Amino acid sequence: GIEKAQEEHEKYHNNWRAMAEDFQIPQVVAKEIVAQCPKCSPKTWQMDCTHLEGKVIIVAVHVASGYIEAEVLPAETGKETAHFLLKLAARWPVKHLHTDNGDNFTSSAVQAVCWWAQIEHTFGGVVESMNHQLKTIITQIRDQAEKIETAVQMAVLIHNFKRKGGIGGYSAGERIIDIIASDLQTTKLQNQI
Amino acid sequence: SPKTWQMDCTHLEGKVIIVAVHVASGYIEAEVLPAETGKETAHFLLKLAARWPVKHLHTDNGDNFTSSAVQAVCWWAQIEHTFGVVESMNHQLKTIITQIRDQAEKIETAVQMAVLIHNFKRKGGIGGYSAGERIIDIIASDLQTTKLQNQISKIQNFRVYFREGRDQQWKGPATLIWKGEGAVVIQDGQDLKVVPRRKCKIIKDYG
Amino acid sequence: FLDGIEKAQEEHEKYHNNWRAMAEDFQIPQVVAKEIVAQCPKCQSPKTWQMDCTHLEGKVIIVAVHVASGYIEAEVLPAETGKETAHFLLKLAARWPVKHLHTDNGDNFTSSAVQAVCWWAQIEHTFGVVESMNHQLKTIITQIRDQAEKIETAVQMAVLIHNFKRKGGIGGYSAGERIIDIIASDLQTTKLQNQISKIQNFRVYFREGRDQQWKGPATLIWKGEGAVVIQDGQDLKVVPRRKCKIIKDYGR
Amino acid sequence: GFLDGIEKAQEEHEKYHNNWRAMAEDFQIPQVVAKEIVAQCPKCQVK
Ligand SMILES: [Zn+2]
Numbered sequence: 001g002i003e004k005a006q007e008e009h010e011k012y013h014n015n016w017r018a019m020a021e022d023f024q025i026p027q028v029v030a031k032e033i034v035a036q037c038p039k040c041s042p043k044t045w046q047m048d049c050t051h052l053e054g055k056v057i058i059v060a061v062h063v064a065s066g067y068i069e070a071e072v073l074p075a076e077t078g079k080e081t082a083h084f085l086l087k088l089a090a091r092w093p094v095k096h097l098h099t100d101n102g103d104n105f106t107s108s109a110v111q112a113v114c115w116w117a118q119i120e121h122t123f124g125g126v127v128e129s130m131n132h133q134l135k136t137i138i139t140q141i142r143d144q145a146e147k148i149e150t151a152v153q154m155a156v157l158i159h160n161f162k163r164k165g166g167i168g169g170y171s172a173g174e175r176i177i178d179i180i181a182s183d184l185q186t187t188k189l190q191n192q193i
Numbered sequence: 194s195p196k197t198w199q200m201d202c203t204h205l206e207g208k209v210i211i212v213a214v215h216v217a218s219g220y221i222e223a224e225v226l227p228a229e230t231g232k233e234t235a236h237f238l239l240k241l242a243a244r245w246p247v248k249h250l251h252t253d254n255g256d257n258f259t260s261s262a263v264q265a266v267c268w269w270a271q272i273e274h275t276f277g278v279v280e281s282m283n284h285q286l287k288t289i290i291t292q293i294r295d296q297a298e299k300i301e302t303a304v305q306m307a308v309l310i311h312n313f314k315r316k317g318g319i320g321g322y323s324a325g326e327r328i329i330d331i332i333a334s335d336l337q338t339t340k341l342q343n344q345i346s347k348i349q350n351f352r353v354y355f356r357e358g359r360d361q362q363w364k365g366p367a368t369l370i371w372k373g374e375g376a377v378v379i380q381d382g383q384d385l386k387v388v389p390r391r392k393c394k395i396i397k398d399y400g
Numbered sequence: 401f402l403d404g405i406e407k408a409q410e411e412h413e414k415y416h417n418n419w420r421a422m423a424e425d426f427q428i429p430q431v432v433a434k435e436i437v438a439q440c441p442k443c444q445s446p447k448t449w450q451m452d453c454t455h456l457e458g459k460v461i462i463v464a465v466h467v468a469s470g471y472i473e474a475e476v477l478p479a480e481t482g483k484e485t486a487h488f489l490l491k492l493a494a495r496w497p498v499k500h501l502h503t504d505n506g507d508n509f510t511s512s513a514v515q516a517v518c519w520w521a522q523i524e525h526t527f528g529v530v531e532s533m534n535h536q537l538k539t540i541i542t543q544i545r546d547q548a549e550k551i552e553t554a555v556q557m558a559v560l561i562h563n564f565k566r567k568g569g570i571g572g573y574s575a576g577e578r579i580i581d582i583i584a585s586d587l588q589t590t591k592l593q594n595q596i597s598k599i600q601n602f603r604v605y606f607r608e609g610r611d612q613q614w615k616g617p618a619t620l621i622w623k624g625e626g627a628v629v630i631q632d633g634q635d636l637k638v639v640p641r642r643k644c645k646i647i648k649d650y651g652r
Numbered sequence: 653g654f655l656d657g658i659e660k661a662q663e664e665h666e667k668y669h670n671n672w673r674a675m676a677e678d679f680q681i682p683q684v685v686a687k688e689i690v691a692q693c694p695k696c697q698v699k
């Protein structure tokens with residue numbers, strides 16, 4: 001397996017995760033194979049903010065499955081963004097966070113929550129497609145709820161558990177549950193063996 | 194049951210805390226309400242049903258838990274409501290809150306940090322798992338069972354054109370059963386047979 | 401069956417599903433679920449390509465990208481005239497189904513040879529992703545440059561590595577699996593639409609229970625072995641075959 | 653062929669409003685295209 005991974009990386013320059021999946025190697029060996037070349041993630045969440053009907057909506061997406069999580073904010077300050085990030089870290093296992101060059105994403109409370117929860121913060125085309133789909137669903141079932149917050153939560157429920165799209169024909173919640181369960185079993189077997 | 198949740202409300206330092214608990218794993222979601230009306234209870238139940246698959250809700254005979262807003266949200270989300278663990282989880286959450294109280298200014302940060310500590314930093318039980326690993330394992334097992342029973346018919350909905358020995362015409366659309374590496378099992382006229390991989394064409398045939 | 405149609409109509413009234421999910425869940429045929437979607441008032445591209453040119457080491461590269469999947473086809477041109485761009489467009493239109501082409505307002509893209517190729521191959525040309533794809537292709541070309549002697553071999557090896565060796569996105573697929581899945585879904589939709597019109601060229605007179613009169617002409621939707629699904633008065637109903645008479649309808 | 657027959661049958665039904673069996677026997681076109689010529693007229697009904 002190690003010889004096949006070295007030959008495949010010498011030809012095509014693959015990364016370490018795809019080699020460790022396709023050749024069934026422990027990940028540190030593929031990490032050292034990638035690190036020895038001179039020519040050269042189930043816990044990553046991308047966050048963004050948008051405007052709708054005079055409100056501020058903050059949307060976080062789990063990238064490997066398309067799992068959405070939205071909230072209605074009363075302001076665009078840093079304390080409410082830190083509170084939403086703390087709730088997201090307390091609900092799901094979060095390790096890597098991606099944002100854009102914004103205002104509330106560079107703040108003392110946001111850095112304090114990221115330090116306390118040990119999240120790797122990085123700054124910088126999936127989140128725009130998720131926001132576009134969320135806008136279409138919100139305008140589709142707007143006339144069933146009076147408030148805007150209730151319509152946002154119903155659109156999150158419809159997007160997570162009622163839209164069986166893609167190649168495999170799987171919803172988003174089943175995909176994130178299967179991904180984290182398979183990753184936990186893989187880390188357990190690699191820690192035992 | 195892998196999809197049963199229980200809800201309760203409590204008081205802490207003059208506030209109102211609402212606690213929902215997944216029973217089979219001891220998984221905790223909690224929030225701080227500014228009141229005890231039916232609208233905030235219906236909004237918390239809607240957020241809980243939008244995040245996780247809730248099918249069976251168990252509550253007591255309270256004041257806000259018997260109302261038109263909670264009834265309408267349960268109708269729209271198709272949740273079965275029953276009236277009669279959570280007190281033990283409430284005492285546990287109060288003890289964790291009093292343990293890390295001197296690290297937070299407001300009570301809301303203390304509630305969310307206690308939820309994170311209880312969900313991912315308290316390993317016990319038999320195998321040595323926390324609550325999040327247990328709820329993910331239970332839901333993954335149940336979903337694997339039901340989707341296996343559907344995916345068998347999904348893989349039997351294909352069509353195979355095969356070739357027999359010493360005849361130069363492609364035979365009719367038999368039904369695929371299993372596709373190996375060097376062999377293909379098909380059912381043709383209620384007869385099971387095994388053909389090599391180089392004598393078959395597997396399509397879906399829209400038409 | 402009728403319980404499945406009623407549950408599917410209530411589920412679409414609440415959540416506005418698609419027809420593939422309803423056909424898989426409630427075990428109804430695809431034409432009935434497509435009619436349920438087609439009756440909703442609140443519910444009413446796989447063949448678009450973009451082209452561009454660039455320079456690399458004194459050579460003129462031309463890149464064509466399928467937009468909805470990110471699928472790259474590249475070539476090295478000897479010059480930058482209109483006849484070579486028309487030849488590259490004719491090869492691209494001969495290998496993949498191209499129906500809508502998007503370019504910039506260059507010289508060679510505004511030419512009589514390219515206009516004649518678009519006329520013969522029936523392509524809609526529109527003048528204004530590709531710059532990001534040119535950037536990524538040039539990074540791969542500078543990454544594997546030492547394994548080739550000429551520049552055309554390096555361009556084609558970078559195209560192969562981008563198409564089949566780089567994985568990402570939602571499901572973790574490459575570009576080739578994405579373009580094949582997208583075109584196959586569009587093919588399934590067109591075949592189902594042909595069957596829908598061919599079935600809906602009929603008409604049904606049905607007789608209710610405890611009556612001897614024939615009712616109004618309802619439109620046929622699905623003709624089963626023992627059941628018949630008809631639409632009448634914005635309502636779907638299932639009548640058995642021994643109480644129905646199917647006639648042709650010339651009502652264009 | 654009978655493609656010019658289809659053109660002349662459309663002109664003849666545009667003037668005189670024939671039926672389909674008469675046009676099928678006169679212009680030697682098949683019965684399906686003759687019934688379609690009658691069907692696409694708003695005033696006539698095939699019977
Ligand atoms: Zn390398």
Ligand SMILES: [Zn+2]
Pocket residue numbers: 412416417437440441442443
């Ligand atoms: Zn609809």
Ligand SMILES: [Zn+2]
Pocket residue numbers: 665669670693694695696
């Ligand atoms: Zn006429």
